Design a protein around this ligand. Structure first.
Ligand SMILES: *[C@@H]1O[C@H](CO)[C@@H](O[C@@H]2O[C@H](CO)[C@@H](O[C@@H]3O[C@H](CO[C@H]4O[C@H](CO)[C@@H](O)[C@H](O)[C@@H]4O)[C@@H](O)[C@H](O[C@H]4O[C@H](CO)[C@@H](O)[C@H](O)[C@@H]4O[C@H]4O[C@H](CO)[C@@H](O)[C@H](O)[C@@H]4O)[C@@H]3O)[C@H](O)[C@H]2NC(C)=O)[C@H](O)[C@H]1NC(C)=O
Ligand SMILES: *[C@@H]1O[C@H](CO)[C@@H](O[C@@H]2O[C@H](CO)[C@@H](O[C@@H]3O[C@H](CO)[C@@H](O)[C@H](O[C@H]4O[C@H](CO)[C@@H](O)[C@H](O)[C@@H]4O)[C@@H]3O)[C@H](O)[C@H]2NC(C)=O)[C@H](O)[C@H]1NC(C)=O
Ligand SMILES: *[C@@H]1O[C@H](CO)[C@@H](O[C@@H]2O[C@H](CO)[C@@H](O[C@@H]3O[C@H](CO)[C@@H](O)[C@H](O[C@H]4O[C@H](CO)[C@@H](O)[C@H](O)[C@@H]4O)[C@@H]3O)[C@H](O)[C@H]2NC(C)=O)[C@H](O)[C@H]1NC(C)=O
Ligand SMILES: *[C@@H]1O[C@H](CO)[C@@H](O[C@@H]2O[C@H](CO)[C@@H](O[C@@H]3O[C@H](CO)[C@@H](O)[C@H](O[C@H]4O[C@H](CO)[C@@H](O)[C@H](O)[C@@H]4O)[C@@H]3O)[C@H](O)[C@H]2NC(C)=O)[C@H](O)[C@H]1NC(C)=O
Ligand SMILES: *[C@@H]1O[C@H](CO)[C@@H](O[C@@H]2O[C@H](CO)[C@@H](O[C@@H]3O[C@H](CO)[C@@H](O)[C@H](O)[C@@H]3O)[C@H](O)[C@H]2NC(C)=O)[C@H](O)[C@H]1NC(C)=O
Ligand SMILES: *[C@@H]1O[C@H](CO)[C@@H](O[C@@H]2O[C@H](CO)[C@@H](O)[C@H](O)[C@H]2NC(C)=O)[C@H](O)[C@H]1NC(C)=O
Ligand SMILES: *[C@@H]1O[C@H](CO)[C@@H](O[C@@H]2O[C@H](CO)[C@@H](O)[C@H](O)[C@H]2NC(C)=O)[C@H](O)[C@H]1NC(C)=O
Ligand SMILES: *[C@@H]1O[C@H](CO)[C@@H](O[C@@H]2O[C@H](CO)[C@@H](O)[C@H](O)[C@H]2NC(C)=O)[C@H](O)[C@H]1NC(C)=O
Ligand SMILES: *[C@@H]1O[C@H](CO)[C@@H](O[C@@H]2O[C@H](CO)[C@@H](O)[C@H](O)[C@H]2NC(C)=O)[C@H](O)[C@H]1NC(C)=O
Ligand SMILES: *[C@@H]1O[C@H](CO)[C@@H](O[C@@H]2O[C@H](CO)[C@@H](O)[C@H](O)[C@H]2NC(C)=O)[C@H](O)[C@H]1NC(C)=O
Ligand SMILES: *[C@@H]1O[C@H](CO)[C@@H](O[C@@H]2O[C@H](CO)[C@@H](O)[C@H](O)[C@H]2NC(C)=O)[C@H](O)[C@H]1NC(C)=O
Ligand SMILES: *[C@@H]1O[C@H](CO)[C@@H](O[C@@H]2O[C@H](CO)[C@@H](O)[C@H](O)[C@H]2NC(C)=O)[C@H](O)[C@H]1NC(C)=O
Ligand SMILES: *[C@@H]1O[C@H](CO)[C@@H](O[C@@H]2O[C@H](CO)[C@@H](O)[C@H](O)[C@H]2NC(C)=O)[C@H](O)[C@H]1NC(C)=O
Ligand SMILES: *[C@@H]1O[C@H](CO)[C@@H](O[C@@H]2O[C@H](CO)[C@@H](O)[C@H](O)[C@H]2NC(C)=O)[C@H](O)[C@H]1NC(C)=O
Ligand SMILES: *[C@@H]1O[C@H](CO)[C@@H](O[C@@H]2O[C@H](CO)[C@@H](O)[C@H](O)[C@H]2NC(C)=O)[C@H](O)[C@H]1NC(C)=O
Ligand SMILES: *[C@@H]1O[C@H](CO)[C@@H](O)[C@H](O)[C@H]1NC(C)=O
Ligand SMILES: *[C@@H]1O[C@H](CO)[C@@H](O)[C@H](O)[C@H]1NC(C)=O
Ligand SMILES: *[C@@H]1O[C@H](CO)[C@@H](O)[C@H](O)[C@H]1NC(C)=O
Ligand SMILES: *[C@@H]1O[C@H](CO)[C@@H](O)[C@H](O)[C@H]1NC(C)=O
Ligand SMILES: *[C@@H]1O[C@H](CO)[C@@H](O)[C@H](O)[C@H]1NC(C)=O
Ligand SMILES: *[C@@H]1O[C@H](CO)[C@@H](O)[C@H](O)[C@H]1NC(C)=O
Ligand SMILES: *[C@@H]1O[C@H](CO)[C@@H](O)[C@H](O)[C@H]1NC(C)=O
Lengths: 191, 154, 191, 154, 154, 191
């Protein structure tokens, strides 16, 4: 395609895999499974599913912090995710399991103005590349965002070629870095 | 505040101030260099996704080159340095356009004009998407015409 | 009023009522009463007064979050207000009552460098247009502003034509969003 | 970051640009259209309250039009999106000028020059207040003269 | 999102603009005044350390004058107002250049070109440091040449 | 030095000590002792040392807030410092003691994923003027920053002419203000 007779239209497509060493890269495999790779050899896997892995209502973050045993980058990503949830006020909605240093978070997504809505809003920004196929509408709906799936499960995993549906991108995580603690409610006089 | 990170690529060039994306920074493409006239616009304008990506790639290159790598990867460096590289509110605009069913940039594909004989190019602008489909080059043909009209004046 | 022969000076005034559907609008009725309207339905009434209404030192935020009977927008405004208070260190100064989902916050203002100054400091920014009359001096004194009133009471209320002194404006609320958590003291070693 | 939201009021116009404050966005119920030249300065300048208000009004219009309203109102959309629509540090400047007894903008009233025959107008600038009273035009008449010089230059 | 604080040193001058650093603002030096042509660049430039320092000094001067001091000093004012005076990401850039063993500005020393007969001056640029050693005036002589060419263009 | 025949190169140095009445100023005496000055008559001394002054693992921030005997600017600086530590998860590493209104914090630094690295990263930015001599390597290491000293002790002090190695400057503190709560971990589900 020539414009003005002398200017030819040409296109680019950036390879963001090369950014793996310095930044978290997020992508989508299919409707339910999405991933955030932290370099190679490690990352998080976010699944919207009807099968729960945690049947209890504990999130022993203090014991996990005392023992360490976890990858600090993955816990940083989890902290950014949770602090990016707006108007989170149901502590039983979120349960965890950090035994042995692993990461295994479960948000109970069980219509407008609810905890599941905020969790899905943060989920689709953490995986902005291809999350729209997972949500019921994918557009024209922010506050009443919803998914038929009942649980959002975030688990540490290993690096594989997951990025089938959307290319890797750090844009979702880097965008959510500014959203931390902006819509959290106060639970104490002294935070 | 506002981005400040400056691109540094001048060795072996006919003039300083340009920037070159290597084969590793591109999907199924070879080395591509943009002159000083286009890259220098990245120092001022606040609404170009491509300039943010150039600063990200340059920061990644410098960080891998100059800083000692840890045993296990840590994301503290980018978590501190992100606001100096990119405009996060540009990402916010693109996401707002996405939820509003407006075409938006996903930061993957960009387009530029290229003069056939001289080889001079405009700053690449992002190719927008809407529900997984790229725009079809007729949805923004007037933008391409205006961009072509901007280079003839230079 | 012509300048350079042909240029006429002209003026416009913005009607920010129409922004009610998207964001809060704060404005002042008299020196003792200020308002933050959310929608055409709800909002917060902020009164500087010498009359207490809670008369106890409890603030059961966690139970209110558990019951989830409150308006999320109003609790978000309350959280922004509290997190915008610089150097808040006396939890006893703030009392609350969220029984049945209502909002009833009370700050005890009973000269320079203490909690009453910080509460007034955030108050005069949350309702920026027209809060200056409520204070002893509109300007000149900043690091310790004072008012003769002893309590600041924030209560959820229904919508009414309240701004008689200043027009509605979102600027007071939108300014304080970036002020959140910039001057909060640490209360725990792990926040 | 910095503001990125782009105004879109081009359909039905003489030129592809500008912006029109309709009867509901203004006191006294009038329609006021500002051309492409005036509104185009909002893309670059970082110290214009009127441009921030234009972005807020346009965002309110687009959000009401394109996003489904929840049953109960939520202020969740403006909280995330504020930094892309306004410069909060401009609000900070006006608050600082307020507390130091300097005239400041409260974002209500604005002034602009209007050419008698051509109808051309400048970008509106805010009418400052001190305490409870607007400034007379004599307090900033030299600024009006400089604006008239700027319009004659272009 | 962006600095907005405006400098005002118009009293007694030949032009309304410009700004003057007194002998108290400088180390072992007398009064130094810079004209409008240089200081006006601070309104737009997002990567000039000297402009950020000018905003800090002006804010300090007006804050100690126009606001009542408390009995024991509080840092609340700068803690809120830092983002309206300076670009914190410029400080982040200098920190990043420091850790990567690149020359960086520590915000102490600046250089400018002064015309011999006219007295006109450039906007000062920061003198960079590496491991406590300033650069030697030959490490950035081409930048000085470019600045001289820029003033000759003006 | 004349350029283009007529343009003389000239230099200026800014005296930032005159900014003391509005903001903190950081400087360095020697490799071990560094200072933050809040105007005159007060400030913080940050000392890298092998001698600990606190043997217990209490800090008791809430009691100090309740008694309110401390300087608010200094406690604000301490809060900014602590909230600027990336990935702080070992609460026993930091002890402190505010008895009588004083300030005395002690970070236990006893080589890439430990709390000592985060504490040193925040330290060398709070005292950015001359902290490079305090470290094992001047530059080239960020994630694996280390010093041979085992404790970082932050104590309130009086004003003297300490700024020997580097000039007073507000740049480090002003830079760290945007870093508060940016790289913290979540400890409770409801913050
Ligand atoms: C980096 O920079 C820091 C800060 O400047 C610097 O720290 C200082 O180091 C010096 C030398 O180690 C310390 O000097 C000693 O301090 C003790 C403690 O007293 C001080 O504090 C009390 C209040 O708590 C004050 O009342 C008092 O005036 C001091 O300020 C003093 O006791 C020492 O004085 C005695 O020893 C000196 C020899 O070092 C004698 O010259 C002096 O006359 C005193 O004699 C006493 O000691 C004898 C045994 O040594 C004894 O026989 C006598 O009977 C008598 O008791 C001395 O002043 C200073 O306190 C440190 N200050 C701070 C702020 O920490 C670091 O040393 C420096 N490091 C590097 C790399 O250089
Ligand atoms: C921005 O938007 C565009 C358009 O919506 C989007 O482009 C799409 O990206 C996906 C993911 O890369 C592409 O899907 C690929 O299609 C090819 C077809 O040959 C497949 O071979 C790919 O699968 C292989 O490679 C994957 C990655 O290594 C492996 O994980 C997989 O197992 C296979 O080996 C993959 O399915 C899709 O073709 C494009 N579509 C278009 C129109 O270009 C882009 O991803 C978006 N980018 C961002 C940053 O979100
Ligand atoms: C910015 O600064 C200006 C100047 O200080 C400030 O203008 C003032 O705004 C108030 C609020 O609108 C005006 O008060 C009005 O005055 C008229 C006089 O006829 C009254 O009729 C109005 O009351 C009616 O309308 C109210 C709102 O619906 C009702 O609540 C009331 O019951 C009445 O029906 C109202 O009192 C005042 O006149 C102006 N003054 C000037 C000098 O123009 C402006 O409000 C500030 N804006 C912001 C955003 O803070
Ligand atoms: C930015 O980088 C530059 C270059 O690295 C750096 O300059 C150095 O600053 C220090 C601190 O001011 C200077 O040290 C001074 O040197 C003179 C030499 O005669 C001494 O007299 C000074 O000591 C006296 O004054 C002190 C108080 O200022 C007293 O505490 C002391 O007891 C003495 O009375 C002082 O040591 C050093 O000379 C310069 N070096 C150069 C190359 O200019 C600058 O500090 C850095 N700035 C920042 C903000 O980091
Ligand atoms: C996720 O959240 C949902 C609720 O939103 C949880 O489901 C609820 O589980 C409780 C039991 O813990 C159910 O109560 C039970 O109801 C049955 C039928 O009335 C009754 O026979 C039992 O004695 C008990 O009262 C409740 O009905 C059920 N609600 C829904 C919506 O299913 C779910 O357990 C949570 N999942 C996890 C893993 O936390
Ligand atoms: C992560 O990014 C690095 C750096 O871009 C990639 O490593 C490069 O891989 C290419 C292809 O094999 C080599 O030619 C380069 O020399 C490598 N560069 C460096 C600095 O090591 C790496 O392939 C990426 N990893 C993944 C899993 O995609
Ligand atoms: C999305 O992809 C994942 C990963 O391939 C699919 O999960 C796999 O499903 C197969 C078939 O049941 C199992 O054998 C694998 O063990 C699963 N892998 C994991 C990691 O769970 C998933 O079914 C796909 N989703 C959809 C909707 O097609
Ligand atoms: C999630 O992380 C855990 C903890 O690091 C992983 O389990 C470890 O796996 C390594 C080998 O990769 C073993 O040497 C460790 O002993 C395991 N630790 C424990 C406590 O069992 C786990 O594999 C990761 N999960 C996934 C799905 O990759
Ligand atoms: C809140 O703002 C909306 C617009 O966002 C206002 O509704 C408009 O009201 C005018 C006057 O009646 C009508 O002409 C418009 O058609 C309405 N617009 C819409 C989109 O409904 C509403 O009046 C404002 N509410 C208050 C209490 O002032
Ligand atoms: C400010 O206005 C409010 C109401 O507009 C005044 O409070 C009212 O006082 C009357 C007379 O006692 C009561 O009947 C109303 O119930 C009160 N209303 C509310 C909402 O409390 C208040 O007195 C006014 N203040 C001043 C100083 O004029
Ligand atoms: C608001 O604070 C004031 C000041 O602390 C409280 O008044 C004190 O109450 C105690 C307990 O009855 C008395 O011993 C003091 O003499 C009172 N001090 C003053 C200055 O009056 C007041 O009770 C608090 N109000 C509420 C509602 O908690
Ligand atoms: C503040 O909010 C409370 C709780 O929503 C309001 O009280 C409720 O009012 C509705 C009708 O609007 C009733 O159906 C509920 O039963 C009430 N709840 C309770 C617990 O009483 C209250 O009216 C609001 N306050 C004001 C001043 O409007
Ligand atoms: C802190 O800053 C103040 C304000 O600039 C300095 O006080 C000035 O000191 C000089 C020299 O004595 C006087 O000429 C000025 O008149 C003073 N100005 C004011 C407003 O007091 C003070 O010196 C600085 N502190 C230190 C320790 O240097
Ligand atoms: C650190 O702060 C403490 C507490 O303010 C200072 O000790 C006080 O000193 C004043 C005089 O300056 C006395 O009136 C107080 O009684 C002291 N309080 C206590 C609890 O001892 C202490 O001097 C400061 N430290 C330094 C090194 O200056
Ligand atoms: C600082 O931490 C070190 C360990 O990192 C502590 O030293 C340990 O003390 C325990 C007993 O409490 C001994 O069993 C260990 O052998 C010690 N380890 C080392 C490396 O010395 C030290 O006590 C801590 N200091 C403070 C003041 O809490
Ligand atoms: C958390 O701690 C409690 C303490 O009672 C324990 O019962 C529970 O099993 C722990 N949870 C996990 C997931 O380890
Ligand atoms: C400028 O003047 C013309 C004619 O008086 C008028 O139609 C137009 O509305 C004025 N400008 C604006 C933006 O109101
Ligand atoms: C503001 O105006 C009022 C009169 O409406 C006056 O009483 C008051 O003193 C003024 N305040 C200042 C600071 O000038
Ligand atoms: C403005 O000018 C009028 C006369 O035109 C005068 O009455 C009024 O007091 C002036 N206002 C101020 C605030 O100086
Ligand atoms: C520039 O040089 C002239 C020479 O007379 C001097 O007067 C003036 O102060 C200098 N200006 C600056 C900013 O150094
Ligand atoms: C501190 O400075 C103030 C003026 O700001 C002065 O009154 C006081 O005496 C000074 N104190 C010391 C110890 O220098
Ligand atoms: C910095 O300079 C000192 C000598 O003053 C030297 O010992 C040290 O190795 C240098 N460090 C670096 C990082 O170059």
């Amino acid at each position: 395609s020539l414009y003005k007779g002398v200017y030819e239209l040409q296109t680019l497509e950036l390879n963001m895999e090369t950014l793996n060493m310095t930044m978290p890269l997020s992508c989508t495999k299919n409707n339910s499974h999405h991933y955030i790779m932290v370099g190679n050899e490690t990352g998080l896997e976010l699944t919207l599913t009807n099968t729960s892995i945690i049947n209890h209502k504990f999130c022993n973050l203090s014991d996990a912090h005392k023992k360490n045993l976890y990858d600090h980058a993955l816990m940083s990503i989890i902290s950014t995710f949770h602090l990016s949830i707006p108007n989170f006020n149901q502590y039983e909605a979120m349960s965890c399991d950090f035994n042995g240093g692993k990461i295994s978070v479960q948000y109970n997504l069980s219509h407008c103005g609810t905890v599941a809505n905020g969790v899905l809003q943060t989920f689709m920004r953490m995986a902005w590349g291809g999350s729209y196929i997972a949500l019921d509408s994918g557009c024209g709906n922010w506050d009443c965002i919803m998914t038929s799936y009942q649980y959002l499960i975030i688990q540490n995993t290993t690096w594989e070629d997951h990025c089938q549906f959307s290319r890797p991108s750090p844009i979702g995580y880097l965008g959510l870095l500014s959203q931390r603690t902006r819509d959290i409610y106060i639970s104490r006089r002294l935070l | 505040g506002t981005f400040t990170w400056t691109l540094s690529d001048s060795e072996g060039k006919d003039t300083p101030g340009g920037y070159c994306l290597t084969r590793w920074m591109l999907i199924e493409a070879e080395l591509k260099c943009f002159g000083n006239t286009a890259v220098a616009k990245c120092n001022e304008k606040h609404d170009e996704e491509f300039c943010d990506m150039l600063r990200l790639f340059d920061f990644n290159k410098q960080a891998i080159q100059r800083l000692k790598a840890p045993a296990q990867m840590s994301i503290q460096l980018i978590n501190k340095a992100v606001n100096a590289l990119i405009n996060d509110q540009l990402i916010m605009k693109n996401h707002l356009r996405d939820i509003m069913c407006i075409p938006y940039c996903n930061y993957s594909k960009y387009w530029y004009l290229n003069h056939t004989t001289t080889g001079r190019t405009s700053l690449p602008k992002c190719w927008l998407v809407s529900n997984g489909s790229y725009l079809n080059e007729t949805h923004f043909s007037d933008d391409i015409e205006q961009q072509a009209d901007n280079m003839i004046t230079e």
